[PDB]
Design a protein around this ligand. Structure first.
Ligand code: 402
Ligand code: SF4
Ligand code: SF4
Ligand code: SF4
Ligand code: SF4
Ligand code: FES
Ligand SMILES: [Mg+2]
Ligand SMILES: [Mg+2]
Length: 579
């Protein structure tokens, strides 16, 4: 097939779209609603408009190339069509970039600038109350910014297959939202925030916890603890023009101190706690010959998936709390016992690449004696803004260290952020626990990587066991519906709602679509974590010295006693009822 684009002749064999073909040959074509290899098929944005001689204006993003095509991507007719579309989008868009949360990295703004489009009449609604939905504990919607591009709808379908994000007909007009315009929390929604990640504007955002955090630091009698997730140190640098795959761990500790936090800890410590409890439980089940399989319980998106679609699996979940909640429980119990602080005055803040983490934190029973495990959860994005609002020169900061007591971590805890991380981490301890040995070879590369469903046979104390890593919520549905769960007897299964693991969470920095093709964001972010694991001296959660002292002096033996009493959490299926 022979193609000519802007006068340049091409003789290729590729079967693909005009748009794909163009980008592969450094030919510029704008796009808006095209993402994840799909566009808005019932309301095409037409930003990708090109002209095919002998046919007219077409959409490049979903039109295949064809021998004999003469294509003009930059004619006046093309640009005025594109300009017209952007102008009409402006007609329903509160174009006030000043206090906007996507103002530094908005796709729509870049399009408005590129084509110099203006609205026929600006959209300045008086009362945004009717446009804003902040009911949810994890997500919020601002429909003054919504372009109706359907990227959230498509991403939810592709990433989770729940189709929790829908087009709705509100009073005769089209919006996006949850089923019957309910609060997402009350629907089958996983609160994974993959919809936010797909959004080209500030229409979708996390539920802000920043006021919680600010009030706590300004409150005289509050002792504010902060602890970031594995993934944060591997990605927050992106929002400070530092590039991708940059370890900024030390800079973060410094930034957090300058922000005024009273204690600097780390969720990787909690991750090591989770392994202590979860490896112990697995070994218990190995020698009780069940119940099998045990599922991980550290992903609140997956927890909600189970609660909403597979409640019969709830009893198979590990009782161990997530690194966030298990750290939190210790922060109100253990940490006062070694600091002299009144438990009531402790305010525990986590930094997460996750929106679902907010819902997990505000679960009614995630507390004891009136004290929440976790009082506030801010996303990676929220922390970035916080650092910028404080005008802290992040890229120029010098490295500091976390406070040891609940800040030290092993290599096992560090790789939690990647898909298969919990699996590898857990196996390192469980094998040592069951074999009563200090084992040399601890790398389980078979459970790593971006394959959606990953399996492996492991041999623990002279017995072969089957494990599986489920990489993404859509892949959970696949694994269960396809009957893969019954093809063999699995013993330990990891499930992460976000493909790639937490490094690809809904609270992570947005990445521009062109950069997404440019850089494998899931593997590059996770590489930071694995590199830490490789160069840490302690690579097993039970070799965490600060953790070992904690169990020795306070909790005792994991899996039983006081440790099982307050560090665990069990999910309950609803009893049978009609109707
Ligand atoms: N809690 C917890 Fe986890 C840990 O440690 C984070 O903390 Fe994750 C990350 N990064 C997130 O958010 S959650 C599911 N387990 C994998 S990693
Ligand atoms: S969504 Fe983008 S274009 Fe709209 S106000 Fe925010 S930054 Fe500006
Ligand atoms: S939070 Fe996740 S499950 Fe809910 S609508 Fe968004 S993408 Fe779908
Ligand atoms: S919420 Fe964002 S991604 Fe979804 S339709 Fe509106 S602008 Fe597009
Ligand atoms: S994979 Fe990580 S970021 Fe995504 S929903 Fe689960 S815990 Fe949250
Ligand atoms: S990007 Fe092609 S129609 Fe939207
Ligand atoms: Mg399509
Ligand atoms: Mg304070």
């Amino acid at each position: 097939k022979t193609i000519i684009i802007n006068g340049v002749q091409f003789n290729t064999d590729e079967d693909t779209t005009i748009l794909k073909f163009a980008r592969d040959n450094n030919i510029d074509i704008s796009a808006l609603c095209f993402l994840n290899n799909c566009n808005n098929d019932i309301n095409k944005c037409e930003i990708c408009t090109v002209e095919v001689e002998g046919t007219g204006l077409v959409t490049a993003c979903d039109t295949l190339i064809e021998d004999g095509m003469i294509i003009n991507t930059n004619s006046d007719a093309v640009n005025e069509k594109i300009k017209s579309r952007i102008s009409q989008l402006l007609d329903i868009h509160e174009f006030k970039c000043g206090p906007c949360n996507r103002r530094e990295n908005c796709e729509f703004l870049k399009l408005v600038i590129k084509y110099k489009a203006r609205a026929s009449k600006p959209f300045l609604p008086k009362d945004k109350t009717e446009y804003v939905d902040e009911r949810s504990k994890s997500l919020t919607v601002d429909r003054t910014k919504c372009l109706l591009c359907g990227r959230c709808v498509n991403a939810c379908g592709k990433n989770t297959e729940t189709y929790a994000m829908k087009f709705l007909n509100k009073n005769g007009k089209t919006i996006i939202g949850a089923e019957d315009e309910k609060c997402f929390d009350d629907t089958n929604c996983l609160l994974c925030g993959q919809c936010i990640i797909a959004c080209p504007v500030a229409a979708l955002s996390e539920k802000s916890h920043m006021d919680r955090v600010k009030n706590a630091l300004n409150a005289p009698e509050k002792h504010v603890i902060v602890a970031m997730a594995p993934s944060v140190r591997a990605s927050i640098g992106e929002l400070f023009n530092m590039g991708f795959g940059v370890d900024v761990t030390g800079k973060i500790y410094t930034a957090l101190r300058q922000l005024g936090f009273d204690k600097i800890f780390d969720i990787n410590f909690g991750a090591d706690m989770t392994i202590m409890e979860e490896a112990t439980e697995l070994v218990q089940r190995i020698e009780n010959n069940g119940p099998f399989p045990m599922f991980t319980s550290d992903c609140p998106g997956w927890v909600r998936q189970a609660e909403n679609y597979y409640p019969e699996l709830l009893n198979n979940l590990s009782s161990a709390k997530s690194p966030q909640q298990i750290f939190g429980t210790a922060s109100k119990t253990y940490y006062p016992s070694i600091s002299g602080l009144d438990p009531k005055n402790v305010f525990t803040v986590t930094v997460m690449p996750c929106t679902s983490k907010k819902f997990e934190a505000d679960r009614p029973q995630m507390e004891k004696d009136g004290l929440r495990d976790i009082d506030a959860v801010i996303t990676t994005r929220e922390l970035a803004k916080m650092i910028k609002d404080a005008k802290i020169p992040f890229a120029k900061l010098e490295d500091s260290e976390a406070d040891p007591a609940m800040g030290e971590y092993s290599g096992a805890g560090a790789i939690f952020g990647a898909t298969g991380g919990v699996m590898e981490a857990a196996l390192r301890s469980a094998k040592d626990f069951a074999e009563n040995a200090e084992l040399e070879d601890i790398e389980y590369k078979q459970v790593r990587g971006l394959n959606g469903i990953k399996e492996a046979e492991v041999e623990i104390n002279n017995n072969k066991y089957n494990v599986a890593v489920i990489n993404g919520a859509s892949n959970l549905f696949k694994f269960m519906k396809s009957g893969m769960i019954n093809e063999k007897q699995y013993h330990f299964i990891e499930v992460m709602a976000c493909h790639g693991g937490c490094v690809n969470g809904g609270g992570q920095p947005h990445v521009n679509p062109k950069d997404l093709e440019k850089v494998d964001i899931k593997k590059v972010r996770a590489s930071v974590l694995y590199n830490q694991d490789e160069h840490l001296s302690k690579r097993k959660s039970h070799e965490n010295t600060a953790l070992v002292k904690m169990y020795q002096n306070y909790f005792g033996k994991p899996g039983e006693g006081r440790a099982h009493e307050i560090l665990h959490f069990k999910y309950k299926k609803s009893a049978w009822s009609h109707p």
